[PDB]
Design brief:
Layout lengths: L2 E7 L7 E7 L4 E8 L5 E3 L24 E11 L5 E13 L2 E14 L1 H4 L6 E4 L16 H5 L7 E5 L6 E5 L12 E4 L8 E9 L5 E9 L6 E3 L1 H8 L6 E3 L4 E5 L7 E5 L2 E5 L5 E4 L6 E4 L1 E3 L6 E3 L1 H4 L3 E5 L5 E5 L2
Parallel strand pairs: 3-8, 4-7, 13-22, 14-21
Antiparallel strand pairs: 1-2, 1-10, 2-3, 2-6, 4-8, 5-6, 6-7, 9-10, 9-23, 11-24, 12-13, 12-17, 14-22, 15-16, 16-20, 17-18, 19-20, 23-24
Length: 330
Amino acid sequence: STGSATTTPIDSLDDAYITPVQIGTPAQTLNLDFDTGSSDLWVFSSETTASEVDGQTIYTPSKSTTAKLLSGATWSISYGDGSSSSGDVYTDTVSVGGLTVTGQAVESAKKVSSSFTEDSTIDGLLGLAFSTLNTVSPTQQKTFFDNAKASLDSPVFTADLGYHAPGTYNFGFIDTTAYTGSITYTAVSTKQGFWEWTSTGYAVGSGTFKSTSIDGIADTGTTLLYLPATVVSAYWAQVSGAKSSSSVGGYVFPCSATLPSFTFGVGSARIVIPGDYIDFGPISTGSSSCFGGIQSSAGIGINIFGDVALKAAFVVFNGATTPTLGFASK
């Protein structure tokens, strides 16, 4: 089997992407944030504290003839940005882009933190990291991809995120029309539960490539590109007036600037992030100070190849017995 679904930016800055997901019988369609940096599929639901729902579409298990309470199971997750959610668990039928899993753990939120409430466009998350990170207790549950794997024509999914435009998540096949040149594959460590790999270096604008190993994770659920302070300093040093602001919480730059591109290495290959991809607009409405899309990972504890990086590429998440990552230009 295969699946293919369109993923759409939630706003004009590509702060995140939502992908329609059919849950239950008859289908309830929710728009979920596909997240390769976590491993829970959770949704706003009829069980979510009423004051914490504001415009989201909810999953109502009682209206699904295929929903079954997973007795005793609870979940609780906190994300790198400080947001969190928690609740109980149903199994139900979940379909993505024509691809159907029966018995998928659907994690029903009883509580969500303010940032989820405040985002009416995201109805939940669909985790695509490794199942070892799944927070369901006392019986850990498998991701959607893990459950679908055996049925897929090929044990892979691909992320093709758009810049200010829709893109695609495909399951079970590689669309050879969706990229240019070849796909370069690189090794993955699953030891932390992430799609963790090692970039072979970087360049700033038309500058020469610096060969240096940068361990990080391919994370569709993170907006920006988080890299070592040395790298990030080298990038922003090429932008007149750019500075790190503790009051704003990272690098900002004059909105009048033209940003340089940023290149990262995948083995011997190179992925170029256009400078426009690194502009995340005024820090506040009407401000002439703009927020940078490349930020320091110092104090995160890990480098994150988030949407800023991934949307410049066609990315293959290969879940074969020995997982790997593939990157192509597009």
